[PDB]
Amino acid sequence: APPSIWSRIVNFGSGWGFWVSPSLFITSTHVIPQGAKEFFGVPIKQIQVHKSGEFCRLRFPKPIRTDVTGMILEEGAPEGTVVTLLIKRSTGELMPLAARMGTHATMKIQGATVGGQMGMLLLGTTPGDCGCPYIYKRGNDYVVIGVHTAAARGGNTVICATQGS
Ligand SMILES: CCOC(=O)CC[C@H](C[C@@H]1CCNC1=O)NC(=O)[C@@H](CC(=O)[C@@H](NC(=O)c1cc(C)on1)C(C)C)Cc1ccc(F)cc1
């Protein structure tokens, strides 16, 4: 993926988050810090936080990342679409993993219900990777489809948290 997209991925709590636009920031519910009084200098009360299972969306009252453009955000990718899971590691190493996305579904993961899309990695995902984006290109427009939330032990299945309607 291009550098402009990688720069949108920043460390966030126990995982990562993705600047969809200067004002919109998506991450995993499992990683958002629950005791924080602010994110990126903005008092938490001024941030509009939305939550759809494991998809956590933060709308900021003013542009924060003015250097980025507004990307397309969609609920998953068409079934069979090969996407790239942009994993950043704590070291700073970039570890783009290719995945073929599959069934959209409401899934039960460890008792909890998760809205998202199953994928298959095509050297895998690890505990610190949640919140990293699933990205693919459609023509000339890059598209983010969700954020990493889970991966099935004993197989290549990974779970991409998506946002509902
Ligand atoms: C906040 C502290 O924990 C973390 O590090 C959070 C991020 C890690 C990243 C995983 C960590 C490893 N490889 C990865 O990519 N995620 C999880 O652990 C998730 C659970 C799994 O990955 C499990 N997968 C499934 O249950 C699962 C079921 C199906 C189907 O697919 N995966 C186990 C492999 C750990 C946490 C979770 C629990 C309930 C939910 F509603 C939704 C999510």
Numbering used by the authors: 1 to 122, 132 to 174
What does the paper say about this structure?
The protease plays a crucial role in viral replication by cleaving the polyprotein into individual nonstructural proteins. HuNoV proteases are cysteine proteases structurally similar to picornavirus 3C-like proteases with a chymotrypsin-like fold. Their active site features a catalytic triad with histidine-30 (H30) as the catalytic base, cysteine-139 (C139) as the catalytic nucleophile, and glutamic acid-54 (E54) as an acidic residue which orients and stabilizes the conformation of H30 (15). The substrate binding pockets S1 to S4 in the HuNoV protease, which accommodates the P1 to P4 residues of the substrate, are in the cavity between the BII-CII loop (beta strands BII and CII, residue 102–117) and the DII, EII, and FII beta strands of the second beta-barrel.
To understand the role of R112 in ligand interaction, we determined the crystal structures of the R112A mutant of GII-Pros complexed with rupintrivir as well as enzyme and inhibition kinetics. In GII.4-Pro HOV R112A, the rupintrivir-bound protease backbone shows the moderately open BII-CII loop position seen in rupintrivir-bound protease structures from other GI and GII strains, indicating that this is the most stable rupintrivir-bound conformation for HuNoV proteases. Surprisingly, there is little change in backbone conformation between the respective rupintrivir-bound WT and R112A proteases of all GII strains. Our structures of GII R112A proteases in complex with rupintrivir further show no significant changes in the protease backbone between rupintrivir-bound WT and R112A proteases. However, our assays with R112A mutants of GII-Pro reveal that the R112A mutation does not significantly increase the potency of rupintrivir against GII-Pros. However, we observed that the R112A mutants of GII-Pro are enzymatically less efficient than their respective WT, and surprisingly, the R112A mutation in these proteases has minimal effect on rupintrivir inhibition. As a result, we observe no changes in rupintrivir potency against the protease. These results imply that with its flexible sidechain, R112 may displace bound ligands, including cleaved products and inhibitors, by acting on P2-equivalent moieties positioned in the S2 pocket.
